[PDB]
């Protein structure tokens, strides 16, 4: 696996110059050190083990923050309960990743954080609590209320995890529609015709595919509210394994504007240098 | 029905094997093996249609 | 049952590490692939591929097109260099930006030799011939071309193929260089200046544009993974 | 500008009474999207139509609308004492805006 | 024989040229059809072959000395291309591959160069302060194709929002720098050393066949890199020309026409 | 079941700002379009701004374009109203409404706002010198 030796050379007149090349045709000139200086004979142990793409993409990301609270319930707004939409593009770390392919090929692997803390310090009196997360795939019904009907997860995976225990993890297996995932879609979900009677019956928004990817994770405590409020938060992370990428694409050079590929603030990225300064 | 391979060892003191177990049916639950191999990156540098020696001239 | 004994390092988190977990989504049936053009095995080949230089980024050249293009003419004083940069491909402003910066921007440390070739957009009459060195470093950065030709260099005749390349071998005391800032891994200066002079008849245009790309060669190779600084998220 | 509407109405029990919102191409002549409020005086205004001519739950069959060309027409049948208020017409506007109407009071004879 | 005179010859049509540079083939695949082995519909397939396999010559536009680019896609630039345009809108999935070939001479005294790049999935940035807010009509301009800005100016109208994309040249229209456009398929016309570009184009997806109708799985993109001079004047001017060749094209499910409102 | 409470009404004086706020409760605030609409002492509806369910779309009337400025915090299922240069024109009663929009036939998005059917109680607001 390891890397081409270099050859030794000597002095050169010839007929043939492999200097010389025509950028024209869309090729780049694969020369070699030994096409141009004098070289010795070296034998080469360096590898490119490390820049694979499993070990590009083998680490784990955070993708999301979900906030949930634990207190008696009245009528004002309360968060007993919390809902997100799974998507990668909450952050820009591993999204800026991932878009240096226009597509893509992997399982998945999940990663649960959990934190917790009191409000007010007038009594300071809690048990430990256990948290469920529950997984709604498109199309499923959705809870209304902390301890609705929906809960009992007859048919959706669910994890329960008890506060002061190891992170809890799960894997998936790929789960796309097509035969790989789609960074980038240049197209619509429907078409205006000259018959429709107004224009919203082919209105839509440019470059969005479908309106849930993947669903919701929803999230709750189990236990019953104690005198006291306390505040709590999930940290997801992502880690993509057995990796397939295709036609690669130039990096993002300027700040995100939303899940398209919009800009709006900077457009500037690069600094001031003299022309004949070192 | 273990599976055992060599390690590229780095420093030395003064070949080496380590074992892997698959534990669940489905695929997705394995771990990553990382016995990675390299390409050629000739369909990104000359996608040209008649390809010429690097010495001979370009057109 | 089997007795047992917990090491240091029980119920941690380590990011990097490489384990099995259970699956959530049991007997699922998965799509099979097919054959489309165009797969990616190593980054490296991202890095293998020729691409512009914005050699410019002067205060008013640079963020917008006219930082690619290097003006030539027939009436420059032949005395002073062209353009110059500092071998630095992960922190030089000029080539941090290129592909090949922008991979490197992810690794710490980086080792091989690297090509430069340059186009000559010109009109069809005309000619002449330029001279581009690369320096080692441990010395005065070159000035003049007096100074340039005692390195590695190479003459380029304008012809009827219009691009030329230089190749920038490996020669460091270190077995890997750094990407970041510093002198103790430097890497050497890069100039360019006129021989002879560009000649050109009557009733043709006196002045035009040059072009840079960057590319490495098939011996470099990157390894300690690291976070890149091109890129921030506000509050 | 807000969508023409009659200053008002009178009818006497058991008759019924018909109301018109007007607006042009890029507002109820142009698309669906045209609901109808009632407000009683020192309360929040009520949604009785939405969506042309449907009824939102609990309301009375009593209530009626319909759409043609640039106007839009509400109809109350079975004219009673308590429905002495307010109506106000909605429309949406190409403009990605919202529009009201002028407002038309009903008076029971 | 030279690499420098070539020919290409499609249907009942033929094309000739003698300063090419070379021809590209994109990431090295040739077009062809599907395999049973990666089929999916189980429609019986149409391919009429040489009723749409053939060139179609778009409108010519005049390379002026302060112009700043154009873009096309596809198939959406051959929407009104007879037999290929009524086959796309009488079925509902369809297929095919491209070849592309532009034309630009000059004289000897003339200089310039011109940068043509195949991107897929070309997607394109708002000029709004809406996400994803652009219109079909526009978003989809035909064989008239579009152009390219030197800043980007954010808009502002009264009446409307106008729907647009607002494309800035150095950004290359998606928010990354030109310069690492090359790693996309690609060719320069430098007016020294050659008048035309060939590049042929497979199909990519991600899946085995797609509708036409929705989806635009190429982009063509043509960006002077060096700016157009003349002896001692400046209003001089130049055409350009495009060319496009539908290759291995069939198209599966069948019904009536479709109206599309632009 | 729906409920929407707004507060932050005063008094103030010409060319000041004032910002207002609304709660809701009993519903998926985090998934639905909102809108401002104020009434003239003894006058008809005028509608003030409106937001949809992504903070990008984001629309005013003629009369306040300029000058205020709406904004969404899903994460407290609030609504706000920023208020500059005052004027005396300005004095009503504002309401805090609830859209009825998104929920299409599946694939479309920033939907026309189809109209309102929960409204709050509302809070006065006087500009007097
Ligand atoms: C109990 C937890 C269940 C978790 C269920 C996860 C559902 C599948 C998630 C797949 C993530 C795919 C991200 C990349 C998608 C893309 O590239 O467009």
Redesign the pocket.
Same mark, same amino acid.
Do not use: N, Q, R, T
């Given at each position: 696996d390891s890397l081409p030796d270099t050859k030794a050379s000597g002095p050169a007149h010839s007929k043939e110059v492999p200097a010389l090349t025509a950028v024209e045709t869309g090729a780049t000139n694969p020369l070699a050190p030994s096409d141009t200086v004098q070289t010795r004979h070296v034998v080469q142990r360096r590898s490119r083990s490390e820049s694979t793409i499993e070990s590009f993409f083998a680490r784990g990301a955070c993708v999301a923050i979900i906030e949930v609270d634990n207190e008696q319930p009245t009528t004002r707004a309360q968060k007993l309960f919390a809902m997100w939409r799974?998507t990668?593009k909450d952050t820009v770390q591993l999204r800026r990743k $991932?878009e240096f392919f226009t597509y &893509?090929r992997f399982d998945?692997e !999940?990663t649960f954080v959990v934190t917790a803390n009191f409000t007010n310090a007038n009594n300071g009196h809690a048990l430990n609590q256990v948290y469920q997360?529950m997984?709604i795939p498109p199309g499923a019904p959705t809870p209304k209320s902390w301890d609705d009907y929906t809960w009992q997860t007859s048919s959706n995976? &669910?994890?329960f995890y008890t506060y002061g225990a190891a992170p809890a993890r799960?894997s998936?297996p790929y789960?796309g529609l097509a035969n790989a995932? &789609?960074?980038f879609y240049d197209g619509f979900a429907k078409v205006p015709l000259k018959t429709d009677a107004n224009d919203q019956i082919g209105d839509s928004l440019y470059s969005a595919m479908t309106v849930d990817? !993947?669903?919701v $994770?929803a999230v709750r405590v189990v236990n019953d509210h104690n005198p006291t409020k306390v505040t709590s938060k999930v940290r997801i992370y992502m880690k993509p394994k057995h990796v397939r990428v295709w036609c690669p694409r130039p990096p993002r050079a300027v700040p995100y504007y939303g899940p398209g590929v919009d800009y709006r603030n900077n457009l500037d990225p690069l600094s001031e240098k003299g022309l004949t300064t070192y | 029905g273990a599976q055992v391979s060599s390690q590229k060892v780095g420093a030395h003191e003064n070949t080496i094997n380590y074992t892997t177990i698959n534990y669940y049916k489905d695929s997705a639950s394995n771990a990553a093996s990382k016995q990675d191999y390299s390409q050629d990156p000739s369909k990104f540098t000359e996608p040209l249609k008649d390809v010429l020696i690097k010495t001979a001239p370009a057109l | 049952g089997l007795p047992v004994l917990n090491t240091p390092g029980s119920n941690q988190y380590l990011t990097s590490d490489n384990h099995q977990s259970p699956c959530?989504i049991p007997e699922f049936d998965v799509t099979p692939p097919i054959d489309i053009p165009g797969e990616v095995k190593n980054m490296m080949e991202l890095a293998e591929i020729d691409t512009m230089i914005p050699l410019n980024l002067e205060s008013t050249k640079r963020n917008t097109m006219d930082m690619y293009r290097v003006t030539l003419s027939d009436s420059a004083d032949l005395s002073q260099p062209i353009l110059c940069l500092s071998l630095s491909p992960a922190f030089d402003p000029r080539l941090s930006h290129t592909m090949l910066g922008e991979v490197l921007n992810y690794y710490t440390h980086w080792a091989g030799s690297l090509k430069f070739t340059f186009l000559f957009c010109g009109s069809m009459m005309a000619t002449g011939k330029i001279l581009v060195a690369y320096a080692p470093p441990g010395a005065q950065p070159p000035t003049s071309r007096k100074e340039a030709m005692l390195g590695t260099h190479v003459i380029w005749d304008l012809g009827l193929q219009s691009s030329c390349t230089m190749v920038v071998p490996w020669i460091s005391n270190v077995t890997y260089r750094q990407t970041t800032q510093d002198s103790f891994t430097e890497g050497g200066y890069i100039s360019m200046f006129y021989q002879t002079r560009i000649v050109v008849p009557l009733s043709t245009p006196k002045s035009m544009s040059m072009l840079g790309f960057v590319s490495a060669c098939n011996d470099f190779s990157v390894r300690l993974l690291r976070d890149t600084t091109h890129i921030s998220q506000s509050a | 500008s807000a969508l023409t509407q009659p200053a008002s109405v009178s009818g006497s029990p058991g008759q019924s009474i018909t109301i018109s919102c007007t607006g042009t191409s890029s507002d109820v002549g142009g698309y669906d999207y045209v609901s109808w409020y009632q407000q009683h005086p020192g309360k929040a205004p009520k949604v009785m139509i939405y969506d042309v001519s449907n009824r939102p739950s609990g309301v009375s069959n009593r209530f009626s609308g319909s759409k043609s060309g640039n106007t839009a027409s509400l109809t109350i049948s079975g004219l009673q004492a308590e429905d002495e208020a307010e109506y106000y017409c909605t429309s949406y506007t190409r403009s990605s805006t919202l529009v009201f109407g002028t407002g038309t009071k009903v008076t029971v004879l | 024989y030279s690499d420098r005179v070539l020919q290409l010859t499609l249907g009942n049509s033929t094309i000739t040229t003698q300063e090419a540079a070379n021809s590209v083939v994109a990431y090295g695949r040739w077009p062809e059809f599907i395999r049973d082995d990666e089929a999916n519909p189980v429609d019986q397939p149409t391919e009429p072959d040489v009723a749409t396999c053939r060139f179609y010559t778009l409108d010519t536009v005049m390379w002026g000395k302060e112009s700043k680019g154009w873009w096309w896609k596809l198939p959406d630039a051959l929407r009104d291309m007879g037999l290929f345009g009524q086959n796309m809108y009488y079925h509902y999935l369809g297929r095919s591959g491209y070849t592309v070939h532009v034309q630009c001479n000059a004289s000897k005294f003339h200089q310039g160069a011109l940068g043509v790049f195949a991107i897929p999935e070309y997607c394109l940035a708002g000029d709004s302060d809406k996400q994803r807010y652009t219109s079909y009509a526009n978003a989809n301009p035909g064989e008239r194709g579009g152009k390219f800005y030197s800043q980007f100016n954010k808009d502002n109208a009264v009446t409307s929002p106008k729907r647009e994309f607002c494309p800035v040249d150095y950004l290359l229209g998606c928010g990354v720098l030109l310069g690492n456009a090359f790693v996309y398929p690609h060719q320069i016309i430098n007016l020294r050393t050659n008048n035309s570009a060939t590049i042929v184009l497979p199909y990519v997806n991600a899946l085995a066949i797609d509708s036409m109708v929705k989806h635009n799985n190429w982009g063509i993109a043509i960006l002077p890199l060096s700016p157009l001079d003349f002896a001692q004047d400046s209003s001089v001017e130049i055409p350009i020309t495009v060319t496009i060749a539908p290759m291995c094209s069939e198209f599966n499910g069948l019904r009536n026409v479709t109206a599309p409102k632009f | 079941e729906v409920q929407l409470v707004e507060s932050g009404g005063g008094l103030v004086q010409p060319g000041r700002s004032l910002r207002l706020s609304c709660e809701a409760s009993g519903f998926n605030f985090d998934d639905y379009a909102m809108h401002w609409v104020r009434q003239a002492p003894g006058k008809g509806l005028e509608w003030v701004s409106g937001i949809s369910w992504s903070s990008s779309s984001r629309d005013y009337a003629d009369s306040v374009k300029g000058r205020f400025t709406i904004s969404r915090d899903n994460a407290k299922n609030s609504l706000y109203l920023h208020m500059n240069s005052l004027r005396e024109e300005d004095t009503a009663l504002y309401y805090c409404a609830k859209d009825m929009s998104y929920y299409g036939s599946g694939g479309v998005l920033h939907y026309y706002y189809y109209g309102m059917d929960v409204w709050g109680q509302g809070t006065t607001v006087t500009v007097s010198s």
């Open positions: 799974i990668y $991932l &893509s998945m !999940f997360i997984y995976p &669910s994890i799960i998936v789960v995932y &789609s960074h990817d !993947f669903g $994770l | - | 959530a | - | - | -």
